[PDB]
Amino acid sequence: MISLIAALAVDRVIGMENAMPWNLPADLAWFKRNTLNKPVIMGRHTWESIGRPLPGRKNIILSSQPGTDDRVTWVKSVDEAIAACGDVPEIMVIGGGRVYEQFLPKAQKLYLTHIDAEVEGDTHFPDYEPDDWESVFSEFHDADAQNSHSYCFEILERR
Ligand SMILES: NC(=O)c1ccc[n+]([C@@H]2O[C@H](COP(=O)([O-])OP(=O)(O)OC[C@H]3O[C@@H](n4cnc5c(N)ncnc54)[C@H](OP(=O)(O)O)[C@@H]3O)[C@@H](O)[C@H]2O)c1
Numbered sequence: 001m002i003s004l005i006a007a008l009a010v011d012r013v014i015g016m017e018n019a020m021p022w023n024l025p026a027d028l029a030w031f032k033r034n035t036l037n038k039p040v041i042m043g044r045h046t047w048e049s050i051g052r053p054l055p056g057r058k059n060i061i062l063s064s065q066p067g068t069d070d071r072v073t074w075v076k077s078v079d080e081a082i083a084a085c086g087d088v089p090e091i092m093v094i095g096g097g098r099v100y101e102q103f104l105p106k107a108q109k110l111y112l113t114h115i116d117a118e119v120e121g122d123t124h125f126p127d128y129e130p131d132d133w134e135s136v137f138s139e140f141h142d143a144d145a146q147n148s149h150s151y152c153f154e155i156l157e158r159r
Pocket residue numbers: 005006007008013014015016017018019020042043044045046047049062063064065075076077078094095096097098099100102123
């Protein structure tokens with residue numbers, strides 16, 4: 001099974017200048033819980049944005065060019081990325097925009113955080129078709145001293 005996980009600001013913005021400008025510790029904790037002990041697939045730009053391997057997960061990087069770090073696994077196509085995960089119950093696709101576009105048609109589940117924040121971005125989550133997806137979990141949180149925007153955790157499953 002393939003799942004996508006992402007955090008979206010207003011208008012599906014996910015990034016600006018190869019960074020995420022907000023800071024929501026509760027959402028990063030949600031990301032860790034939902035990805036630990038699973039393989040994670042990311043594009044090369046997102047690898048550079050994170051800047052180090054994510055511990056406790058098999059890190060698989062898509063790039064058309066040879067890899068430059070043997071602490072992670074490098075692959076050259078979507079099918080190779082999936083194969084490199086092996087026989088696991090759930091593969092997590094962790095972006096960025098280009099990678100999400102390619103894996104969305106193959107995904108059964110979306111883990112989306114909707115953040116009540118406006119930021120001028122250059123990368124968006126794919127326009128997906130709402131009719132194709134059932135919301136099976138949603139949990140809203142007001143802003144607090146650690147998290148400066150309100151946010152909603154949602155899990156959707158392909159109908
Ligand atoms: N808010 C969130 O949830 C979230 C999550 C992830 C990322 N982000 C943000 O998203 C932005 C990065 O997204 P992005 O769309 O620019 O880049 P991306 O999807 O992370 O990386 C694109 C790169 O991946 C490689 N690639 C993708 N598909 C491939 C394929 N089929 N075969 C081979 N290589 C492939 C290519 O690398 P080569 O050029 O080396 O061939 C391509 O240039 C950053 O701002 C980041 O902070 C946000």
